Design a protein around this ligand. Sequence first.
Ligand SMILES: Nc1nc2c(ncn2COCCO)c(=O)[nH]1
Ligand SMILES: Nc1nc2c(ncn2COCCO)c(=O)[nH]1
Ligand SMILES: Nc1nc2c(ncn2COCCO)c(=O)[nH]1
Lengths: 262, 262, 262
Amino acid sequence: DPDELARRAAQVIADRTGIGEHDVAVVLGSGWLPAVAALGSPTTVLPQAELPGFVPPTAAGHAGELLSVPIGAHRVLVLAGRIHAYEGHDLRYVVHPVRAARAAGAQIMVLTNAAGGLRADLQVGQPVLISDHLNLTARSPLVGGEFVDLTDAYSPRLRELARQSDPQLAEGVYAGLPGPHYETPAEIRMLQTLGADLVGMSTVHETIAARAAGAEVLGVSLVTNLAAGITGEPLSHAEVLAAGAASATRMGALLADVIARF
Amino acid sequence: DPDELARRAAQVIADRTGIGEHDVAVVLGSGWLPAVAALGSPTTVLPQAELPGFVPPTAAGHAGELLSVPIGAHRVLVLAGRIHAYEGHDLRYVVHPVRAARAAGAQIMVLTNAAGGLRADLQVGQPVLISDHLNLTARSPLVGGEFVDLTDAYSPRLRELARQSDPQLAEGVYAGLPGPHYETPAEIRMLQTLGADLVGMSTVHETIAARAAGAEVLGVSLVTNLAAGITGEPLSHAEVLAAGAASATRMGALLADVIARF
Amino acid sequence: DPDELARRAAQVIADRTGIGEHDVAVVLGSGWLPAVAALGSPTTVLPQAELPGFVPPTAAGHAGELLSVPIGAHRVLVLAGRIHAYEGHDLRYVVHPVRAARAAGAQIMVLTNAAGGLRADLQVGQPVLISDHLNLTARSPLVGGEFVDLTDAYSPRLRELARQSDPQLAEGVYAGLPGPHYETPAEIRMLQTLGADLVGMSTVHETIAARAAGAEVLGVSLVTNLAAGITGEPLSHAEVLAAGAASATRMGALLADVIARF
Ligand SMILES: Nc1nc2c(ncn2COCCO)c(=O)[nH]1
Ligand SMILES: Nc1nc2c(ncn2COCCO)c(=O)[nH]1
Ligand SMILES: Nc1nc2c(ncn2COCCO)c(=O)[nH]1
């Protein structure tokens, strides 16, 4: 039972952080690990790996951390590192950190990801609010008849708040694909056709789980690269890995500024 | 294997219903269940849990009811209560009633479901014949080289008959997505770009299992709401649930009227 | 370790063929099996079932061979037969042959398949190079975190060399779907909107795994029919299974000529 397990993770978070409630949670995955530092000074860091339901049984590699970051009166549960459906994990493990954070008190989930830009405009290193997603994984983390409306899955209010801190923030539609391979240029063209501005390999399940749980979601993509076939050149690994890192800098700090608006 | 379990279920069904052939099956999906009551004069009802292979090893709720009913010159195997793929279940379980049906004599499977309407001119509470589908599940109920052709998977003949019963019947293309979450508006715009008129969370696999097994299929969606982002206002749990307790005697009258024409 | 298993496999190839490296692998599946004898005299033939990682206990039928054929400058591993996701095998097993091939020295994989033609200039019996693919399986043979750019997944250079042998060779984007059911005509319309020229039931994962493993890939579809709804007439397990076994000599000879240009 995932809510039951989320409640244990949440008890342990409370126990280990000494903080009984955590009213915002921020998942920083690929491309966004620069963002961690920059959310602000953690009072507790712990390994996610320790936590009930967290870093998956089968494959145990080395998860990231759960930081407890006060931002004013908001106690931010920072999830530095996430697991991905592409790693083989049953989606309940994939969304468990989100569900744990809910149980730990998160009103709002800030879900971040590394994305390829599908769009004209888009610059490498550009943060892009997610206005909506395409779930192109053919899955849901919801099992049974949990029929969650995904209208305004990425809170307009939270996009408004974020633009209060950076009025020049774009938004775009994120296509969530399983990965972990990057996309073909034909898949990219397809995704342009399907209505996506961004493409990536996470997030959609987390949002769904977050929304199912009642949490408001702020989604932020970092364009780590223009998607395949957009420029005419192959993808640069160093660019995907590093070109957005000062962005993820910038953004964690911007982050802290937006959470403070919550 | 699945086919042998389907024939075992069929034997138990013939035994327990006293009916050697049920030349029609009806699967009563979300929002169609109340329609059972207006179907005719069933002569056996048995809990589906009674039947070999009906209840999956994984989840256990309260399985539905299997009704044997004469309608016109047909014996109709009515499945009230179904399992869904979104409940976690191997598809062999999701299509088993259809396979058990065909093994029990079924030549025509009447597959009903609840759909978001993707054309803003479909009326909430109006049935729509499925003229075709988009299997967006990335799954098939068929295993190994079962290379079934799905041209006219939804028999034009049956839709023609259905329309003699009710010539105000729309037809349209149904996108089968896994569920159980509803679609984002962005997914809805994609679905429209993809040529879908209806969207739901079932049927596709049963259609495919039915065509494989050589049964013809009449698919009928109840538009229980306009899909996400169509209205410019969020979906409402309040409509999706009642949308066909209201259509109930009318849907069961339609069903019985169309089956009689078969 | 998939890669270790590949390695285990490649040492048998070396050992049973007596040749330390096969610089080209060809995967013959559906529609291309008859072409094998026309490729050349094999210096060795081993059943696939004898190699580590290759074929099942659960479901056992009767499996392909692996041939070692010199072709032009090349020592070619011929994989006669493949297994398919639609048979239900973990993808690690589906792409093991290619990974084994790559481990055996294959830096070029020629992946052949049978496809529905969606594009107006294609005809039944035509070989079509695969220019790009749409992976519509919602799966990936990659797990965890290799960085795999699928830009030029189907090497333009291999395509241009092939065309030095038969410049006749058309090319198209291949949509790789789960199978084993064929597509509904609405699905084919969608695929066309998605930019697919060809549709089939294999290849994409074997590509990905070849690309991740550092091989270039030439894809060859045999158009074994038009896609569903193109002719307004059903589809064929065996106008598919060989509207190209009509042309064994030519298909083997096409392959041998193309490979000689590499
Ligand atoms: N799928 C995909 N992911 C990317 C790309 N660039 C960076 N990432 C990071 O992983 C995907 C997370 O949403 C890209 O072009 N495509
Ligand atoms: N997938 C999907 N299913 C719907 C929609 N409206 C009604 N249904 C079916 O709801 C009953 C449970 O699936 C919709 O908009 N999308
Ligand atoms: N998916 C798909 N595969 C095809 C089609 N035609 C030939 N093939 C290849 O068939 C795979 C099973 O033989 C088609 O129209 N669709």
